[PDB]
Amino acid sequence: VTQTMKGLDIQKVAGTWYSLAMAASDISLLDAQSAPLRVYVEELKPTPEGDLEILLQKWENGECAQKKIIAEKTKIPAVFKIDALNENKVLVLDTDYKKYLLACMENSQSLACQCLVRTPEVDDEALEKFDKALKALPMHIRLSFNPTQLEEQCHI
């Protein structure tokens, strides 16, 4: 990923988001309801220090579970770290704060990206920006959700 948001203000991505679309480099990352990167964003909570708390849902061991993860800031405003055994990066590609946000997670390559939107509607303009960003990346699975699904736990 060589598309980052110039001039990102992380405080202004705060609040409610919907995972309208998702893509990944490997089918197995998004294939099943319980695939490892099939995660649905609920809320972004930037910290005063400029870290990013992410509230999401995931189908795990038979049901829809809530998880909270923190992505720590780096020297680059558009790039956060979630490290454990593995060094992983969260990248903000593009946002207008009020309607859409494009982001990817990548390892150290495998990756997964999402088109986030503020409301349970299909934003054709946001999806066209997402597809343009992906034309640069080696994606092998793409999913998108309808407005009914966007209002359900785990997009059921």
Ligand X SMILES: CCCCCCCCCCCC(=O)O
Please report, as ranges, the residues that interact with ligand X according to CB under 6 A: 37, 39, 41, 54, 69, 90, 92, 103-105, 112-114
Task: Please select the residue that binds its own copies; options are 33, 66, 119, 148, rule is CB under 8 A.
Answer: 33
Give the helix/strand (H/E) hosting 130. Answer: helix 124-134
Residue 131: CB minimum distance to its own copies, A: 9
Residue 114: CB minimum distance to ligand X, A: 4
CA distance 68 to 54: 6
DSSP 126: H
Locate breaks in the chain with C to N over 2.5 A; list the residue preceding each.
108
- Number of residues engaging its own copies in binding (CB under 8 A): 11
Q: Could you tell me how many residues make up the chain?
A: 156
Residue 90: CB minimum distance to ligand X, A: 5
Residue 114: CB minimum distance to its own copies, A: 15
CA distance 54 to 59: 16
What's 104-119 look like in SS3?
EEECCCCEEEEEEECC
Q: Nearer to its own copies by C-beta: 20 or 71?
A: 20
Name the residues that contact its own copies, by CB under 8 A.
27, 31-33, 140-146
